Amino acid sequence: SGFRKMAFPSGKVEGCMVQVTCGTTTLNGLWLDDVVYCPRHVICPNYEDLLIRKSNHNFLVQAGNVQLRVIGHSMQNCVLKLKVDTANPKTPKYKFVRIQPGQTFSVLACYNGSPSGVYQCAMRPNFTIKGSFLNGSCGSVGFNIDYDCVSFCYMHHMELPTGVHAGTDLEGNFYGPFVDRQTAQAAGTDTTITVNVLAWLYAAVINGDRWFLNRFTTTLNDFNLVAMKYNYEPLTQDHVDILGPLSAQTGIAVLDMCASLKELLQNGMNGRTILGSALLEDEFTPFDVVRQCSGVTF
Amino acid sequence: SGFRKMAFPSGKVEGCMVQVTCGTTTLNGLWLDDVVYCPRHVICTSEDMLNPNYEDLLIRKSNHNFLVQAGNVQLRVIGHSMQNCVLKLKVDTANPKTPKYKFVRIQPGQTFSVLACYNGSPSGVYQCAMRPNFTIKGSFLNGSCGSVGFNIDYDCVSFCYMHHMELPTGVHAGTDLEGNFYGPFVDRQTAQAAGTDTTITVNVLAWLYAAVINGDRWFLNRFTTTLNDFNLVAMKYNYEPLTQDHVDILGPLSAQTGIAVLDMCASLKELLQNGMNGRTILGSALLEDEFTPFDVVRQCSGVTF
Ligand SMILES: O=C(Nc1cncc2ccccc12)[C@@H]1CNS(=O)(=O)c2ccc(Cl)cc21
Ligand SMILES: O=C(Nc1cncc2ccccc12)[C@@H]1CNS(=O)(=O)c2ccc(Cl)cc21
Ligand SMILES: [Cl-]
Structure with missing residues (x-):
């Protein structure tokens, strides 16, 4: 629970985080193999013109208490790639x-x-x-x-x-x-991420919170009109398919759960909470719900 | 921000997590130096859980009954002892990743x-x-x-x-x-x-100071409160009593925002009475109590907005 x-x-x-300093600017870098990746604004704009004036020794890269030696540099879009003399032994x-x-x-x-x-x-x-x-x-x-x-x-x-x-x-x-x-x-x-709110409603049902369920179902068309009114992202058939496993686990169809979301949008929570929250949570994807409700390890 | x-x-x-297995039970252990710490109930069955005599179950075990796995390597148990509800398994290898x-x-x-x-x-x-x-x-x-x-x-x-x-x-x-x-x-x-x-009052106050640091003052009022009157009201909402220690601990946040602890207490009193009226505080529609005064000082800026 x-x-x-x-x-x-x-x-x-x-094990990949390093400190990159260029003149007065100091920020973080990602050290993978013999390359340090960091925002190109560390040299601050006409970025290619500012970078051509810099030499390798102008970039100070520190990994813990060890100074890494920059042996090359190039820009890719808004990221600066600093070639260093040592490959990161902790590169995953x-x-x-x-x-x-x-x-x-x-x-x-x-x-x-x-x-x-x-x-x-x-x-x-x-x-x-x-x-x-x-x-x-x-x-x-x-x-x-x-x-x-x-x-x-x-x-x-x-x-x-x-x-x-x-x-x-x-x-x-x-x-x-x-x-x-x-x-x-x-x-x-x-806007609110609708598929994520639905996934979090399924997570609440799995954890034993069913007060918001009702006997009603709805259509994808009818629901998307409601979602458009409350600044919710449109729900697609792909979202419905992605919610399939959670629907099968709880026995609540996706459009059945959509009618619960419709009633929560039009009527509120009435002093109640869902998973300790008085707002509808949208920062848990369907996969996050499945992974947290069946302990996937790394 | x-x-x-x-x-x-x-x-x-x-780098300290290991797997401890004793018979059919499998759980996690903490490997620090040459010792693995884990819950002593790893030696119990589901039947044993009603009234387990841990001392009687442990005396029947030998070192080789405990299987400890660190990644893909089996650690050798060379000793065992119980300290309260934790089991301490002495292993043959010190953890090189011990912080x-x-x-x-x-x-x-x-x-x-x-x-x-x-x-x-x-x-x-x-x-x-x-x-x-x-x-x-x-x-x-x-x-x-x-x-x-x-x-x-x-x-x-x-x-x-x-x-x-x-x-x-x-x-x-x-x-x-x-x-x-x-x-x-x-x-x-x-x-x-x-x-x-109950709600951790000192933590809710710290989070109200964090909201002021981030530029939000809608919930403040022109009132103050005595510590006793604040506690008489707060306990009616299942809030923990606020002690003089809590007021002292909130001193730095009070100095940073220019809002006295008892004036922030008065604002909390009003929030409990009125609710939020469709508003949020730091993206929340409830009063948050899982941030300590120390957590707020650590995460928030030293310059109020
Ligand atoms: O946005 C920027 N930094 C920051 C990032 N995260 C949190 C911050 C909190 C406080 C102050 C700066 C913060 C910088 C500097 N400010 S800036 O000169 O406006 C700027 C502009 C572009 C770029 Cl890509 C970067 C920036
Ligand atoms: O509580 C226990 N385990 C668990 C711990 N954390 C989360 C769980 C989620 C689901 C199922 C079991 C969980 C066990 C077994 N159940 S028990 O026999 O009641 C029990 C009793 C005491 C002690 Cl110390 C331990 C236990
Ligand atoms: Cl403590």
Whole structure:
């Protein structure tokens, strides 16, 4: 029993965090094999023109108490790749993956190449993440684990005026219409991740919370009109298929659960909570629910 | 900016998790130096759980009855002893991944990270608090016994909890790393129930200070309160009494935001009376009590917005 916002064990990622310093700027880097990946804004804009003036020795890379020697540098989109003289002996099995909005991941928040905390979060539909980052956190990474393989999906670049965060995949491509510069940028109007709320309703049923269930079912068309009114993301047939296993485990059809969500949207919780929350939670995917309600280890 | 339920990086603890098997029972163990620590109920059957005589079950065991597995390597048990509700298995190999560590017994209201494990393999990490009724609202399935709670302030890991059992309400009970249970619990399958739980008042106040640091003041009011009048109201909402120690502990956050502890207490009094009226505080529609004053100072900026 119990349902918590659970992050992946961060150990495989901790052994990759380094500190990158260029002039007065200090941020975090990801050391995998003989390459350190970090936000290109560490050199700050006309980035290729600023980088051509730099030499390898201008980049100071520190791994714990050891200084790594930079022997090459190149830029890939908004990420800077620093070739170092030593391959990371702690390099795990890894992939660079680009995630979609609604997908979740663990963030290992770091400062000065030293990990300070781990939390779970989701890529919002507006491509921002509601993280917890202070100055110096740039270069902190987001990841998932599949058995023994770490899939790096996010590198932190910036904070927006509303306190939300923006960053890139590990190939330097931003999530969202953001740019790495000091300019007027704002997060778009956000929406609720509907498939995730439904998965969390299934998790509540598994944990013995059924007060919100009713005898009614609905159609995908009728429900999407309701979702559009409450700033909820549209629910697709793919989402319904993905929720199949949870529907079979609890005996509650996806459109049956949709009618419960419809009634919660039109009428509220009436002083009640679901899994200790007075709001509808959307940062647990269907897979996160299945994994936490059947202990998958790494 | 931002405020999340944040756990400590678990790497230092992952390198200590092992699997302990005794007959048909399999659970987790903590390998530090040449000792594996695990719940003593690993020597019990399901039948034994009603009224187990641990001393009588343990005397019938030899070192080779305990199978300890660290990754793909079997560790050799060369000694065993019981300390309260923990079993200590002396092994032939010291853990090369043993971090700098301490065993600390925490008080209710204190928070810690939990590395949930199954078969000596870590599956997830989450942050939680020792409730005033000495239980924890964890996320544990069968096989999680032996999973540990810890804090890593600076570079030393302070082990504070080892998981032992789930109570009928779905909440969890366990011990410190010396085998002493938190709460009036026993490692028996006897009728045991968690006491009525209360809200950790000092933690809710700390989280209200965190909201002010992050730029939100909608809930403040022009009133103050005496400590006694605050407690008379708070206890009607099942809130823990606020002591002078709690007021002293909130001193730094009061100085950082310019809001006196008893003025923040007055704001809490009003929040309990009125509810939130469709508003949220740090993305929550409930009053959060699983962030200590120390957690807020650690995660929040030193400059208020
Ligand atoms: O956004 C940025 N950093 C930060 C990231 N996370 C949390 C922070 C909390 C406080 C202050 C800065 C934070 C920087 C500097 N600020 S900036 O000059 O506006 C900027 C602009 C672009 C890029 Cl890609 C980066 C940046
Ligand atoms: O509580 C116990 N195990 C578990 C611990 N954590 C989460 C679980 C979730 C599902 C099922 C079992 C779980 C066991 C067995 N059940 S028992 O015989 O009641 C029991 C009693 C005491 C002691 Cl110390 C231990 C136990
Ligand atoms: Cl304590």
